[PDB]
Amino acid sequence: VDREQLVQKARLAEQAERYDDMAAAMKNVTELNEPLSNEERNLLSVAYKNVVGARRSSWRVISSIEQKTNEKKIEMVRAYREKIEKELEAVCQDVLSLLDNYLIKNCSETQYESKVFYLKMKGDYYRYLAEVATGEKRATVVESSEKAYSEAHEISKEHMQPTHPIRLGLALNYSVFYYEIQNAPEQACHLAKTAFDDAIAELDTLNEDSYKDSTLIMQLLRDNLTLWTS
């Protein structure tokens, strides 16, 4: 099966809302080692967000029930939560392999937007690991998440405009990492506010699609700040 058919398959899967299929297809596309176009990168990102997002949603339901909850009953709840955990970990592992072994790797020195996009994604899937990890395993994935975000942030600050949706999007998820994962609400709020503030002045200079994406992210930054300062 040729590359364009795999990509076509990913688009078909998407329309059919078969996101496991969509992700396996873009995994295969990525593994051909040719660069992803912005639209193919979107397909990859949407696919895996849905796949891992379903697991994240399920894990929260089960975890919540587990906490509100008989040995045989509770053991099944735990076993089922772990089942979901191992799926979530398998998915993150796949994405993270894709990032390390192809996607981040094939970025040249001045492909900044792509570097920021993929390092952000690396930070994201380590973060999802951190959401369920415990102990020494947790410290490792938290440190890996932070490392990826930190490197993407520095590249974005030196080589992208404060108005760029990829830069804004990174600051958003990075601040969420601080708040939700590091329980560092001050760091979270400072990052979110400065990112929002830095983008105001030249926001109207954005391309119409970029403007759309950035204002959405800025609204999420604000919603988060409000929620975190309540």
Binding site: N38, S45, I166, L172, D209
Partner: peptide
């Protein structure tokens, strides 16, 4: 309610 994170796609 939880913190909101970034959309997976660009326009």
């Amino acid at each position: 309610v939880t913190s909101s994170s970034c959309p997976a796609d660009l326009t």
